[PDB]
């Protein structure tokens, strides 16, 4: 019901700032279809873990602690993409990160609420 | 929003901040003016440990 193509990742020295994008289309998919869009990272032996959400008719947002100030989420509904801003990074925010998302409005911060999943892009932070 | 307006002209003269971090900070207060102190705040704290020795 909608795909998603995330893209941006690479590498960084510690300090750096990237900023990732995420491609969403469906065949009725409008600019206040009740949808909730997130990132996820898996970072070097660990599962996917939930780093921001943003709802998209609203564009009400959510982040994971961990990552609070230093990055933002944010969605352009007339090109139909979510980005998220990455700054002030670190080598612990080395990590695939997915872009995700749900038709209605999740039930948890895990993995198991988000049924339409991009295909991944490696962030490296060097120090 | 002025804890928008602030924070930009607050990050824009912080003097440890090279150009990149700058433009990135400026461009998450674009992205998520909901997190305008929070943004400020991280932007405080990458001035702070980039404070030359």
């Known amino acids: 019901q909608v795909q998603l193509q995330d893209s941006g990742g690479g590498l960084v020295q510690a300090g750096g700032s990237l900023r990732l994008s995420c491609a969403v289309s469906?065949?009725?998919?409008?600019?206040?279809?009740?949808?909730?869009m997130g990132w996820f990272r898996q970072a070097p032996g660990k599962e996917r873990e939930f780093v921001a959400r943003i709802y998209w008719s609203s564009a009400n947002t959510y982040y994971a602690d961990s990552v609070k100030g230093r990055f933002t989420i944010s969605r352009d509904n007339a090109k139909n993409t979510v980005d998220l801003q990455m700054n002030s990074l670190r080598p612990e925010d080395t990590a695939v990160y997915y872009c995700?998302?749900?038709?209605?409005?999740?039930?948890?911060?895990?993995?198991?609420?988000?049924?339409?999943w991009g295909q991944g892009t490696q962030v490296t932070v060097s120090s | 929003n002025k804890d928008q307006q602030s924070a930009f002209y607050e990050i824009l003269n912080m003097p440890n901040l090279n150009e990149a971090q700058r433009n990135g900070f400026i461009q998450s207060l674009k992205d998520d003016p909901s997190q305008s102190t929070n943004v400020l705040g991280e932007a405080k704290k990458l001035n702070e440990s980039q404070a030359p020795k």
């Open positions: 469906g065949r009725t998919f409008s600019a206040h279809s009740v949808y909730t």
């Open positions: 995700a998302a749900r038709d209605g409005i999740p039930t948890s911060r895990t993995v198991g609420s988000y049924n339409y």
